């Protein structure tokens, strides 16, 4: 729908270019299908659309504002920890949906490129592998009881490994 989140290259089709002096049953069946099925269906949907527009109603998104993270939180203060764990779990669900979006992009690219996919579907491939490695360095080796504190301990161990690495000249 939003073609910046869900990009779709334009469906360039070749002109028919026929050689036979003979008919194609596809096209005339398409005409019949249109003037039989698509016309009453479009009538019904236009009716339903104008009846929506008679009494239109709106809904919103609930922007959630940021909160003191758990690193700014004291050992034992259960209220701050609760709020921080909640915003973490929120971001976690959002990250899963991001990963789903990128997997969807990858699959759709694979299908449209079809056979010649392993040369011109590498962009979405790398955009999948990078975010995958992020998720792996962010949420992977936890368990069912994941939490902000566990992700933080993981990040801290990894930063320690990186410090010990860059210690080497």
């Amino acid at each position: 729908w939003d073609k910046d989140v869900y990009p779709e290259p334009p469906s360039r089709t070749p002109a028919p270019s026929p050689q036979t002096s003979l008919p194609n049953p596809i096209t005339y069946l398409t005409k019949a299908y249109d003037l039989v099925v698509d016309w009453p269906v479009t009538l019904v949907r236009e009716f339903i659309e104008r009846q929506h527009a008679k009494n239109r109603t709106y809904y919103y998104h609930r922007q959630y504002r940021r909160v003191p993270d758990i690193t700014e939180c004291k050992e034992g203060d259960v209220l701050c920890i609760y709020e921080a764990e909640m915003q973490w779990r929120r971001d976690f669900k959002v990250d899963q949906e991001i990963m789903n979006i990128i997997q969807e992009r990858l699959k759709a690219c694979q299908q449209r490129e079809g056979e010649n996919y392993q040369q011109n579907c590498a962009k979405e491939l790398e955009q999948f592998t990078k975010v995958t490695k992020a998720y792996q360095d962010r949420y992977l080796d936890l368990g069912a009881y994941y939490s902000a504190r566990k992700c933080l301990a993981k990040q801290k161990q990894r930063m320690l490994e990186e410090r010990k690495a860059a210690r080497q000249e």
């Binding site: 758990i70 690193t71 004291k74 050992e75």
Partner: protein
């Protein structure tokens, strides 16, 4: 242990200090539970003596309910007083002995390094 507490009156159900506590509501869940216990007591009394149930001893049942509530009110008042006294003496002792209960000052999760335990 609170028997040797100073000013402790011997065999005083409700000292005058307890009158400064707020009383119950009289609609407390535990007093209506005691009334329910009295009603079930009357019902069981009738069941044991081969009598009808919920029909026979309405004066006895009313008396059971009222006795249970009229005892539970004062017993609960005494218990509220005793728990008040517990908190009172605890607060006084921590306020008199702060060296044993120091003003602890805890840290954040950015400065402490809790260890990571993968699942894998």
């Amino acid at each position: 242990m609170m028997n040797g507490r100073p000013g402790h009156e011997p065999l005083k159900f409700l000292p005058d200090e307890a009158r400064s506590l707020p009383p119950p509501k009289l609609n407390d869940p535990r007093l209506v539970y005691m009334g329910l216990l009295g009603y079930c007591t009357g019902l069981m009394d009738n069941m044991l003596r081969m009598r009808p149930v919920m029909r026979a001893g309405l004066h006895r049942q009313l008396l059971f309910v009222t006795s249970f509530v009229f005892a539970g009110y004062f017993y609960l008042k005494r218990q509220n007083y005793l728990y008040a006294v517990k908190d009172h003496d605890m607060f006084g002792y921590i306020k008199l002995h702060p060296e044993d209960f120091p003003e602890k000052e805890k840290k954040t999760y950015a400065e402490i390094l809790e260890p990571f335990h993968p699942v894998r």
